Amino acid sequence: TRDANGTWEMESNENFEGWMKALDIDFALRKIAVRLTLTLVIDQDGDNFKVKCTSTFANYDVDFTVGVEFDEYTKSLDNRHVKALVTWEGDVLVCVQKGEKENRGWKKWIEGDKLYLELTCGDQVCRQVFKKK
Template sequence: MPPNLTGYYRFVSQENMDNYLRALDINVVLRKLVCLLKPDKEIIHTGDHMVIRTITSLRDYVMDFDLGVQFEEDLGPVDGRKCQTTVSWEGDQLVCEQLGEKRNRGWRHWLEGDQLHLRMTAEDEVCVQVFQKVK
């Protein structure tokens, strides 16, 4: 049975965010701003339904979805694109595949103790963020 990711997580660290954003064709000014942000994550996981909120001082981004069901995701707040998104479990990792203009786009979340890890990919770039569970 996969883990329940419900909780509130504070930002700890990130690696390679600028190159990841460059792969998404984000302009240099917005890339620099995003690299300064220290987002929090709030996850509500109820059965096969999940809500993942990424909370920043600039804006929040909310994903509200059912596991295993493809939906159109509006990534307007991120990079102005829409894609067909499916989120499902692969073992203990929550895996998101985002089909659209960018190759190899998606992410995966997993827990290591009280830390939530996020690995985001776009084209050939990988960004890793780590969050600490606080409640």
């Protein structure tokens, strides 16, 4: 479905390390990140999205409108400037972040009370699954 609203709790997280390594995240912050609980809160009204990812130590919040390019500065991730664009490819929510890294972005599939998330950077894909709280 297109409706991604909800509080989403992580069920699984595969190749998180490899993805963070492809983004050049400090080996320090990687070790912290693998231990922290991650809650994904999405607020969706029409084309307008507010996404908040929250750990005990890190917040990653981004707001966007589907179909409208936006400049992004990944301050609490790898601290790069990208040109981001989120679109629908059928029911798949796709994000393409143009910049230094190739193949960079993420795809979200909402299947009922499950959310599947693939994050990509270079030749690395991290695969996550959340359950609606």
